[PDB]
Design a protein around this ligand. Structure first.
Ligand code: CL
Ligand code: CL
Ligand code: CL
Ligand code: ZN
Ligand code: ZN
Lengths: 224, 114
């Protein structure tokens, strides 16, 4: 289990002077999504390269999925898997049209549910749970990344979580509770002049999974 | 040969109107694109840049503008609530490890309301 964030631990959006669009866009309508596919190349020893066409916009024919370590790369190489990720293009390199992501991989066989499951998200604004809603998945074991993405996607459309210039919210974190054990991610960008998509998204490289049946999601936002 | 097509070439709008200028690469797949505006027969001033897809970078003169790079070929400039003061000629450019390719320019006139 992970300790809840100490006061000044959380990133303050007022201390970020770049364009929030560069965070917003990671959680827009688009994302990497593939069903039942096998790695077809590898660049470095901790990544795998999948052949996935961006049918929608033509932005990529292949996808580099990057992991925290060799073991995760080894584990899923040769496996038939489902991919779901928030992807980046700017400082994305690997040896056509390309994109890059971290983690976001689950075994295909035996992970498919017959019906979609609902997971409740409770959104606290300055400590008041004034909005709740459900995200949905059809995977038994789902990555935190996918759930995070689905959650922020909604919140962008419906609460302007991220805008072009900045955000109405000063701080924000997303908490994943699974029984007793729990963890969280900082939803705001590191402080400074520019936002580093690659670095931010790297947090997903642990490929952390949760159980769709018994996970709950809490999101804590504070205003300025 | 690599080129850049802005759209439209000439536009008139009312104060308060949402205006969108388009810029599309043809025969290229370049990472860098640029939106400038030119003041009155003088220097180009950079509003926004983009180092690639899903990247926008502030320029010298970004206030009151937004921009958007949803794919390599396309870099759009967004005026959310147009101001007369944004009356100008605007120039798009793409760029590629050596050269720059410029659009023909968009003359935008933003008039006052009733
Ligand atoms: Cl930035
Ligand atoms: Cl200057
Ligand atoms: Cl400068
Ligand atoms: Zn000057
Ligand atoms: Zn730059």
């Amino acid at each position: 289990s992970q300790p809840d964030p100490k006061p000044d631990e959380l990133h303050k959006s007022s201390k970020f002077t770049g364009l929030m669009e560069n965070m917003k866009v990671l959680y827009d309508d688009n994302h990497v999504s593939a069903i039942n596919v096998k790695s077809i190349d590898q660049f470095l020893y901790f990544d795998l390269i999948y052949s996935i066409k961006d049918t929608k916009l033509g932005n990529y024919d292949n996808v580099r999925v990057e992991f925290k370590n060799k073991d995760l790369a080894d584990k899923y190489k040769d496996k038939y898997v489902d991919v779901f990720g928030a992807n980046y293009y700017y400082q994305c390199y690997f040896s056509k049209r390309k994109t890059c992501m971290y983690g976001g991989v689950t075994e295909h066989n035996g992970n498919q549910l017959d019906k979609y499951r609902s997971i409740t998200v409770r959104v606290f604004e300055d400590g008041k749970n004034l909005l709740s809603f459900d995200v949905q998945t059809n995977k038994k074991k789902v990555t935190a990344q996918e759930l995070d993405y689905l959650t922020r996607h909604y919140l962008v459309k419906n609460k302007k979580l991220y805008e072009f210039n900045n955000s109405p919210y000063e701080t924000g974190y997303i908490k994943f509770i699974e029984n007793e054990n729990s963890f969280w991610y900082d939803m705001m960008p590191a402080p400074g002049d520019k936002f580093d998509q690659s670095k931010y998204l790297m947090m997903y490289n642990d490929n952390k999974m949760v159980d769709s049946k018994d996970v709950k999601i809490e999101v804590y936002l504070t205003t300025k | 040969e690599a080129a850049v097509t802005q759209s439209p070439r000439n536009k008139v709008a009312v104060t308060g109107e949402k205006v969108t200028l388009s810029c599309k690469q043809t025969n290229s797949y370049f990472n860098n694109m640029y939106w400038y505006r030119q003041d009155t027969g003088h220097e180009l001033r950079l509003i926004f840049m983009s180092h690639g897809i899903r990247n926008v970078e502030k320029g010298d003169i970004p206030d009151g503008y937004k921009a958007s790079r949803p794919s390599q070929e396309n870099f759009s400039l967004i005026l959310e609530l147009a101001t007369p003061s944004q009356t100008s000629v605007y120039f798009c450019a793409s760029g590629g490890g050596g050269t720059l390719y410029f659009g023909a320019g968009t003359r935008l006139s933003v008039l006052y309301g009733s």
